[PDB]
Amino acid sequence: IREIKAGRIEFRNDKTGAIHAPVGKASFPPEKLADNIRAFIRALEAHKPEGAKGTFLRSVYVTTTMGPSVRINPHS
RNA sequence: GGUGAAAUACCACCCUGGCGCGGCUGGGGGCCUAACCCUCGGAUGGGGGGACAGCGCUUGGCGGGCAGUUUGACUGGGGCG
DSSP states (O other), X not given: OHHXXXXXXXXXXXXXXXXXXXXXXXXXXXXXXXHHHHHHHHHXXXXXXXXXXXXXXXXXXXXXXXXXXXXXXXXX
């Protein structure tokens, strides 16, 4: 619960394979956004079920609640 | 707020079902015609078929027409038992 409040985020692929979560506060330091971004990258990459069969990490989108939307490379 | 298993804004990811156009690729129906077959009926040019079917290889399958084997031992015979 501690971190839940302290600095949390969670996983939960919806109906057909999608997750939703935060990885870098609003105006907040770009680099910071980068950090939580990649952090989730991994967290996820890890949770990745052994039952995958092909291009696992699919549609990688970063977008805003009510704002723009576009994919990103969980890599560089 | 309100209603339920669910929130109602706009902006995300993603599925069900159908349309537009764009890469791939499968099916299919049309004369032609130069390879090719037959051609020509008295001439190397005309005629009829024409991408088929001939035909080379690879595929699958009917398949006695054929080939080569086999279809046991005991048991007061063999076999049948």
